[PDB]
Symmetry: D2
Subunit: 492 residues, 4 copies
């Protein structure tokens, strides 16, 4: 999911629309934009679909104001109903709207809490709504008008104590300003930037990824430190504060492997370089373990793996060819909701340039293998076009565990690598060879960019969840609810 916050001095609507467009790749299921207008009212527009379908001129005109927040959704909890599209809103205290990229591992627990203790009403099954509500009640502890930044920070500190999981949030509190914060583990991405308008008036903005800053002409300030909350007043005064007891930098690794745009710099790590470094480490592993292999061409599975593949072609000193033509009107299958929708998407998204495979042993390279969805079809395609032999290198290690921090992997059994050896997976997808990046490698691939990061968040790879609290019983519940069939039945 992508969230954007802009506490500016001019109409932010097109700028947010534009921001969500570059972040569109983080959520294609719905999009929402909420602004505050001159009459301190919230102007909202959210619905299922792409940013380009969701907002029409008619909406844009209604979306007035100079401060606003937006969100593109990739459903990881609840349902695919437009009622779970973000932002969310609570009319008190003050009027708060919030966008969240993450996932609360203790949502059910906080739910009992909210009704019985806090007296708030959660109408959807979205954990982001819960989040906004935990925040809301915490904030509801400071009655004297007005809320002080210390109070806001104090509320988020309290929230940090209650909630568990991963979250990059952005919110607006009417008559107050824009608030943004990052979980105590720095799991989900969030960067702060600014655009100095004129000598004395500076606009600020937070976003999941820096590309949004770039595309809008905002300067990079830095990443919102883990556990740190930011607070920009309606008057333009920036406030900051560590709101976690033991803040630590454990960035999501999948963000580098696949999620983020290559042109973003997450925690001082150019996703682009990390991905190139991934190409280096993987091509090195291939050279070392597949040194006998006869390869005629190195073909990337668009779009994510390309540079990774490009680097691998260079390392192996083999040619890099765009054997697969991507349909520019089909999105990312992986972040699509249903497996059948994704499974089919793969055949409508890619088509071989037959000449590139005929009488050729090709090495197909992809950023990662998750459900197996892509690799399965891709290889057949490669074959049908005359590939003599097809090997597959994965820029990411086998993915054997559920993601509970903002990526839809609730069912381990849905992952192809689950309970399977590399060789079995190879046999399933029908590749002559299949090789996986080594975790320790991938880690250096990323770390090389910022050694300060000691440990990443890579549960989907090693099952060690940083927030600690994630256990087998939770994972069980989670699968019972979010497995593909349970989801389908919910889709009626």
């Amino acid at each position: 999911c992508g969230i954007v916050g802009i506490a500016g001095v001019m109409p932010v609507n097109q700028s947010i629309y534009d921001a969500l467009t570059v972040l569109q790749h983080r959520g294609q299921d719905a999009a929402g934009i909420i602004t505050i207008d001159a009459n301190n009212c919230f102007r909202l527009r959210k619905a299922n679909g792409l940013v380009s379908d969701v907002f029409e001129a008619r909406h844009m005109q209604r979306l007035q104001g100079n401060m606003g927040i937006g969100h593109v959704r990739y459903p990881t909890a609840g349902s695919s109903s437009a009622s779970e599209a973000q932002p969310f809103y609570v009319n008190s205290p003050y009027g708060i709207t919030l966008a969240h990229n993450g996932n609360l591992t203790n949502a059910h627990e906080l739910r009992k809490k909210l009704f019985e203790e806090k007296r708030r009403h959660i109408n959807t099954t979205s954990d982001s709504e819960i989040l906004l509500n935990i925040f809301a009640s915490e904030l509801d502890n400071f009655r004297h008008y007005p809320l002080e930044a210390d109070n806001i920070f104090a509320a988020i500190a309290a929230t940090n104590r209650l909630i568990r999981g991963a979250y990059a949030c952005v919110a607006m509190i009417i008559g107050h300003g824009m608030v943004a914060f990052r979980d105590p583990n720095g799991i989900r991405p969030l960067v702060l930037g600014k655009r100095d308008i004129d000598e004395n008036r500076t606009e600020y903005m937070v976003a999941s990824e820096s590309v949004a800053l770039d595309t809008l002409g905002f300067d990079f300030l830095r990443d919102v430190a883990p556990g740190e909350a930011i607070y920009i007043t309606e008057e333009g005064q920036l406030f900051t504060r560590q709101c976690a007891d033991n803040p630590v930098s454990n960035p999501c690794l999948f963000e580098y492997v696949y999620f983020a745009r290559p042109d973003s710099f997450i925690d001082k790590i150019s996703v682009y370089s990390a991905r190139v470094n991934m190409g280096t480490k993987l091509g090195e592993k291939i050279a070392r373990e597949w040194e006998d292999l006869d390869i005629d061409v190195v073909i990337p599975i668009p779009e994510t793996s390309c540079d990774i593949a490009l680097e691998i072609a260079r390392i192996l000193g083999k040619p890099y060819r765009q054997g697969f033509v991507k349909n520019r009107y089909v999105g990312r299958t992986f972040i699509m909701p249903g497996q059948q929708l994704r499974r089919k998407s793969v055949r409508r998204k890619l088509n071989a340039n037959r000449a590139e495979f005929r009488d050729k042993n090709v090495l197909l390279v992809d950023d990662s293998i998750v459900r197996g969805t892509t690799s399965e079809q891709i290889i057949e395609m490669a074959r049908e076009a005359g590939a003599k032999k097809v090997y597959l290198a994965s820029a990411a290690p086998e993915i054997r565990f559920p993601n509970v921090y903002g990526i839809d992997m609730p069912s381990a059994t849905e992952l192809i690598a689950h309970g399977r050896e590399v060789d079995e997976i190879r046999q399933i997808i029908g590749a002559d060879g299949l090789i996986f990046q080594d975790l320790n490698d991938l880690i250096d691939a990323v770390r090389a960019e910022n050694p300060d990061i000691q440990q990443f968040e890579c549960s989907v790879f090693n099952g060690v969840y940083v927030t600690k609290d994630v256990d087998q019983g939770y994972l069980d519940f989670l699968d019972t609810l979010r497995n593909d069939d349970a989801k389908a039945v919910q889709r009626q």
Copy 2:
């Protein structure tokens, strides 16, 4: 406007729909229904338009639960925007949704209060929204979870203490139940009824008029006493309490003159009888004041005046003839949003049976004349139809004052009787005679059915406003804010 609220054991959506349909005459502008499903979640559906347009199968299937409220709107505050369609909802404390028929006379005073003081957010210009928030802020003064009936009532009384104006309201508090209250003056209509299901389960509903009970097969209980608050818990328990300091019954006289449906009984008064009664008084008045006149036929201006005219035709021993054909597909032109719309709607609404007027002295009868839209056009028609002489009789006294209790009449200058003597009004519409029911006759016509009512809310007639908080500055205020030009301008 019309509100309904059903707390029962069966799904209420259809019942609420059918109720809104029979109360549709109270608000053709918008309709809303919100229910509580078994998950204790709100299911809402509200938008601009008639009940038949607003609700379709797709919507009905979504409106699950056995408890829900409904609303048909005739804007009297804010704007025509569907965002001000009702009901309104706030998620804390507990989750409350409310529908209001009336108008608060101290909105401005409360808007400022709600923010700086009670920390709530009002996103519209609707007083109904403000009203929900006072109840909420009052309700938010209790935390001993769960709310006891007493606290609800305590919030309502604290609410009445705060608000001024007319209001018949119904709401739902997630986890507690349905509540319904009436203003300390009993201006806006509200009745309670039940539907025993078995040995214990008895269904409860509230609605602006008893016709909604009739159609729904609900047993009539009584009018919700002025200032009373009704509270049906989720478990089915009915609690009532007087929440006004010194309540008094001052029913809106206009409900009888025109607003309500004749098959309704308001404050133990039958609108049908009250209307015939008006015709008796009007007939007797015509019999003495115009005695020396020659009338060939008595023609009602459909549809509200029909019975009145039938009865008048009775008094005078003259033929009642349905000289005017009303278009089944044109609603109440009176309650339409703009004067230009209403005017065009009158030629569409009615057409003359030339036979019934030619070479005859006709007596047109109408429940009332307000802006003079209908009468001005009706007379031109009678003439065109070959009518010798056209006389008009309004079952109602001259309307010279603005209504600030939930009836759209903000600008006294838009009322034809304003600044005019009967004869001036006669000349404008072009009648050869024009007679108005006297005020003391109207009141006696309605009281004849329930003498306990000592005084009626009849400010539109006598400029007397029971809430004693209405004044010239306030009236001028309304006039400016909502005059047809102000509204028409605002719509663009």
Copy 3:
């Protein structure tokens, strides 16, 4: 169904909208408006729903031009799909659009013809589309540009030879003008009028009923003679001609009994007077056959029967009371598509003013009894409100045969009077007494207005179809297809 044609000198769109509004009572299922603009292009807008829902300002603005035709649909053939909404259009020869009030009894036959012989393509199951196509092919016999009025007339004469049934049509032929014609039996209504704009420019218009002329300020010229076609050029030149070999005046009788608005004059017969005359004859029959009967009040079943009832009250010298309050947001149940929709409509459309029935023997009067739909519920209602005894007088004779001329009565078995004695019908609806108008009476009731009419079209009453060609095998097919269940299954 209602059709309107206006060959005018100014924007006709609002005028047509207004025309369809007064004719709305002839078809509530869909509406369509097609104009010709300055660029001799057809501007069309048609869809299911009421005239008021179908056309929005956005449509109105697109509906430019000074010549146009409109239609309100009451489905009697095909399906209820918006694709069968009229007008219809064929791009050649010239560009022709047509609206039809009627029904072709030989549609299936003309269908084979059209493909094989005429080479035209019928895409819907509407006989009106077929009609337009038979016309189109006939017209396609005159190649030399341009078509002469003699040719147009000749085409319609040919059409009159081919097609069978009832039809009032209106069409526009691009670059040519507006054409209108009536079947050779004068079954369906159609009147011609005009509005002289300025010394030399006269606008013309045809319509199902004169009220449309009235409402628009058009002067009545006369009824389009049976078999006669009219042709108004784009230049304003009116042409006329008898286009049938044996033209005869056999007006639809149901039009007087129930279909048309009382304020219309069909074939020099004021529907209003015919209906009053119906009240006379029926009250006379009641006085003569129910002379012992003890009646306390005469109550009409709104809307159609009122004047009929009013007259009956006068004849019996009993009071006329509006015991039933009609919901002004529910239309005519009878012309509604499905029996369950109609059956229920009856309970949402009418509600007793209880006081009017309590301890009273009431005589309920309705224009007609068809399926029994209304009478059934009405009586229960009358009872539930305390009617001691309830009698029912029908302004129309028992209706025992299918209508194949423009009214949806394809299944005789759906008529309550089918194969039943008056007494059985009385027992079914549960009335203490039930009396039917005598055909011969009804005929004089109507004839009295225009003795020139020797014979009416009243097959639904006496099963003698004027077009002759209607036989049992056709009737059988017709029922197999249009019976309520076959229709329902078609509604999927």
Copy 4:
């Protein structure tokens, strides 16, 4: 634009959808699919928007039949109105629906003709509609029911005799079958293919590009020869005939340069190879004309140029780096309707990986420069990204002439190369160098794949129009009628 037509034994809707999806790059403005159901009725669904937006399950379930055609539009005539969305249909003779990819250069001449002469009605300003009507009017010259293959061909030849311009068309004649023809010059692409089902039933499809065959699992047959007409009957028979006087293959060169998808083979030419070939020629040109230059990296401007650039990077022995990230959710900015839309779309479409440009001399490569929209913005980005020197190379020759064959380039003044020497263009976009592929190189680059093609339709390049009916007055005409300001003005 892209057209598809499938005559098969299975329902074609999904297949047509998937085909339109892979041909979506040929027209993002509108999409249309019309089928023939078992009742020999047309089922259409066309509207403005992408394939994914235009068609939803509701629509697909309605598009029944085994034969249907489809169309994805990029307006080049008329307006952007959905009424000019394709396919178009006429009901006589027999019922024909047609989809056209191209542009007729003698529209005006035919509009007058069709009315006064052939008595047909054109309701839009689309030449495709006019085209359908000529075929129709020609087809309407036969009456010996049914039409023999020969008559169809006879109508097509008579049609070609009448029309001028480029056109790849596909149509369906109710009761006969699918027909497809290509202009006498073979300008617009069209290929035929099949899908044998069993011993006899073989499915047939036509489509602007072979990729549509590939994705659909259809066997490639051949390109529809210039002037040829393909006719598949309803019973499955395939007839072909040359319907042009003196046909000749003059394929649209621009289809290879940019328009078509690389995995397509047009006129036995692979777009992928043609493009690499362009890169070889461009690479060799850069190698000689700029030899004394220092380039650090070669960066394609995604997405059309990618392979070209890869290959150029090959020629020069320089790194190919995906310096530019393209937004997956922004289509071909080139084919967007207005210059203001395209411009905003470029900043959205692309973003620079700062790493790849900083302190480097970059070589940007693009399939072409037309209005200069992309290049002007791309260069600013490279600079901003820290780039020392920014050089640009267009795989295509300077574009100085309007395309009148189905590519929106009406105003030569809107083409940057117009009235300019390379260097002037270099200065405008702000490159430190700008080189264009020579024309003779382009042609040789494409011909290298099918030397039989002697000449290409390349008027945009050399002002030479094979139809020899295009002239200055005609070009000036276009310019005036459709210049961005004319169009933008018209849209309002």
